[PDB]
Amino acid sequence: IQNFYSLLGVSKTASSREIRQAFKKLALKLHPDKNPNNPNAHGDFLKINRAYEVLKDEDLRKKYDKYGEKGLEDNQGGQYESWSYYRYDFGIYDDDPEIITLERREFDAAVNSGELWFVNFYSPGCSHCHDLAPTWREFAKEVDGLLRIGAVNCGDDRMLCRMKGVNSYPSLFIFRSGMAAVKYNGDRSKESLVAFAMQHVRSTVTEL
């Protein structure tokens, strides 16, 4: 019997990252715009997209896990993006193991834990975010293990970004439980990011 998990080819315990990756693979092969000679391409993709939109959201996935398709409509999940969007603007940091992409629950835990986190708040369709992406990845490798490096997709949770006083993108903030967040305001070079992160790593909560 079909369910959203088996439709995407993933386990019921898959992470949000695994779910994006499985969905993306389906999209890059099957997108209707790329398969115009196939009349069912549109309908088939609508079903995969509807699955993805439920599983991507923690509340909606919990509800689905518990009750199946309760309260869903047969034709919801109908608005999908271009092939190019899935190819270049979707799950941006999913193949960068040095960067953790945080959803709301995990973001709140991160900032409460006491660990030092430096988080890139970005949004889909953002040219400055794409410009910064390769450098954020290179930076995350350089400082790997010295502090925690995060990313938040504001496209997926606008209110989280709003809550944290993020209204323009990219916005880079460093956080540690018990201290006020500090915004990064440098030139976005890899050496600038490193020098900024490292002053905060050096500051512990005490000094010599």
Homologous superfamily of 93-208 in CATH?
Glutaredoxin (3.40.30.10)
Tell me the C-alpha distance between 19 and 16, whole Å: 5
- What type of residue is 166? V
Tokens of 80: 């999908």
Q: 179 phi and psi, to 5 degrees?
A: -130, 150
Any residues with CB less than 8 A from the CB of 76 and at least 6 apart, and which? 50, 53
Find residue 100's DSSP bridge partners: 150
Interior angle at CA 132, CA 195 and CA 203, nearest 5: 25
Query: Could you tell me which of 117, 173, 182, 181 has the C-alpha nearest to residue 146?
Result: 117
**Rama region for 183: left / alpha / beta (φ>0; ψ in -120 to 50; rest):** beta
List the domain boundaries for the chain: 1-92, 93-208
Are 94 and 153 a contacting pair, CB within 8 Å? no
The answer to whether 119 touches 151, Cβ cutoff 8 Å, is yes
Q: How far apart are CA 114 and CA 43, in angstroms?
A: 47
35 is written with which tokens? 């398969």
Measured distance CA(147)–CA(194) in Å, rounded:
11
Element (H, E) at 82: none
Tell me how the structure was determined: X-ray
Closest CA to 170 of 146, 139, 147, 201: 139
CATH number of the domain located at residue range(s) 1-92 in this protein: 1.10.287.110
